[PDB]
UniProtKB/Swiss-Prot annotation:
Family the UniProt entry places it in: Belongs to the peptidase M26 family.
Localization: Secreted, Cell wall; Membrane
Gene name linked to the record: iga
Stated role: Zinc metalloproteinase which cleaves human immunoglobulin A1 (IgA1) in the hinge region.
PTM notes: The Gram-positive cell-wall anchor motif LPXTG is located in the N-terminal part, in contrast to such motifs in other known streptococcal and staphylococcal proteins. The protease could be cleaved by the sortase and anchored in the membrane via the two potential N-terminal transmembrane domains, whereas the propeptide located prior to the LPXTG motif would remain attached to the cell wall peptidoglycan by an amide bond.
Record protein name field: Immunoglobulin A1 protease
Length: 145
């Protein structure tokens, strides 16, 4: 019949934090030329030469090197969870603070029948038979192509 505990404010520590993160892009350096790995990462890569580019609506973009690319079932699907290593980057994720910038990507499989999920697959699906009917499954980024 009571709820008695303590707290503390307790001056907090100072770290680096990304607040207005409007969008998050992934680039690579495989063939010596940088390109946009917008989707379809497949199996997580063996070597971590990627670097995450976070574009913000408040201030300019930030480039940070990747640390760990793994696969985690968000709802029983191939969702790539990627973490970012910075000297002190704290990400207010789900009302709690994590010591690394971690974010999830989207998709995996390509819809040969009808590119309803991604551009890299849409441009391939349309070129097969232009006539017919097509629908989009979600907003699709054309950076992929």
């Amino acid at each position: 019949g009571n709820t008695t505990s303590e707290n503390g404010q307790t001056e907090p520590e100072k770290k680096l934090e990304l607040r207005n993160v409007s969008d998050i892009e992934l680039y690579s350096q495989t063939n010596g030329t940088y390109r946009q790995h917008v989707s379809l990462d497949g199996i997580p890569e063996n070597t971590d030469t990627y670097f995450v580019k976070v574009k913000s609506s408040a201030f300019k973009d930030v480039y940070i090197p990747v640390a760990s690319i793994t696969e985690e079932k968000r709802n029983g699907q191939s969702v790539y969870k990627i973490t970012a290593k910075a000297e002190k980057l704290q990400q207010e994720l789900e009302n709690k603070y994590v010591d690394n910038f971690t974010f999830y990507l989207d998709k995996k499989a390509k819809e040969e029948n009808t590119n309803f999920t991604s551009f890299s697959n849409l441009v391939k699906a349309i070129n097969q038979n232009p006539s017919g009917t097509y629908h989009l499954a979600a907003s699709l980024n054309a950076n992929e192509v």
